[PDB]
Design a protein around this ligand. Structure first.
Ligand SMILES: *C(=O)[C@H](CCCNC(=N)N)NC(=O)[C@H](C)NC(=O)[C@@H](CO)NC(=O)OCC(C)C
Length: 247
């Protein structure tokens, strides 16, 4: 997250931290995610497309820090890694960038709700906030484009939803952005999600309720003028989500 402020998991209880185990003992951070139900975490397909082996991933809930323990945190294995079959990556755009991970503890149980671990609500069929609405993003991603390391503390910032019409302008993204994607940015171009923030949530207060409106997917650079962050439009994937979360 470029700009913004440091936060605690208490303020972002649905945030899931996803790591990948390596040959040896090295565990590195991969992407953010969101707990949509006790047994399900939603993230982005591009985070796992190159290593679709469910056994190499670890999901943490209730975690405020990147490389250290947080009281109340819970560790999970991935029982089922569901990637979207129609995922594809063009020059800039990443299509159908959405994934589901079924989690289970070593005891075979799902997440147990607490003050630091809660689910976030999904949107209704084709019901998104009005453009110009303020939403929040959370993540352990880069604080600056020139950084190679991630911040140790979880960060959050606020960006505004940009219309499809404005985002498709020539100086923005043109026809590269579709209706299955949502653009959001800071009106001053000072804050934005960045590498390391993918898979994370774009949360919007929709009719008094905190809703998972988008998933951090892509963008040209980070916090660049006329280059909004692009998010996977969750409301357009409800049928896909429902069909893969049953049994
Ligand atoms: C997470 O993996 C990351 C989130 C970027 C969010 N960016 C903004 N809000 N501006 N996504 C990606 O890295 C995604 C896989 N790829 C890109 O975003 C690429 C192509 O669009 N963009 C890019 O600028 O990458 C070049 C990197 C810096 C070498």
């Amino acid at each position: 997250i470029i700009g913004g402020e440091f936060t605690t998991i208490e303020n972002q209880p649905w945030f899931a931290a996803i790591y990948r185990r390596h040959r040896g003992g090295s565990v590195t951070y991969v992407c953010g995610g969101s707990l949509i139900s006790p047994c399900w975490v939603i993230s982005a397909t591009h985070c796992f497309i190159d290593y679709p082996k469910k056994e190499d991933y670890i999901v943490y809930l209730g975690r405020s820090r990147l490389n250290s323990n947080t009281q109340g945190e819970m560790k999970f294995e991935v029982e089922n890694l569901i990637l979207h079959k129609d995922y594809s990556a063009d020059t800039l755009a990443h299509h159908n960038d959405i994934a589901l991970l079924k989690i289970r503890s070593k005891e075979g149980r799902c997440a147990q709700p607490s003050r630091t671990i809660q689910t976030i609500s999904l949107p209704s069929m084709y019901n998104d906030p009005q453009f110009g609405t303020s939403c929040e993003i959370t993540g352990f991603g880069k604080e600056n484009s020139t950084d190679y390391l991630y911040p140790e503390q979880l960060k959050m910032t606020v960006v505004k939803l940009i219309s499809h019409r404005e985002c498709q302008q020539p100086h923005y993204y043109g026809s590269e952005v579709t209706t299955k994607m949502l653009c959001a940015a800071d009106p001053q171009w000072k804050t934005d999600s960045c590498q390391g923030d993918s898979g994370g949530p774009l949360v919007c207060s929709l009719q008094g309720r905190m809703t998972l409106t988008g998933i951090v997917s892509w963008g040209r650079g980070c916090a660049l003028k006329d280059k909004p962050g692009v998010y996977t439009r969750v409301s357009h994937f409800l049928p896909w989500i429902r069909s893969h979360t049953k049994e």
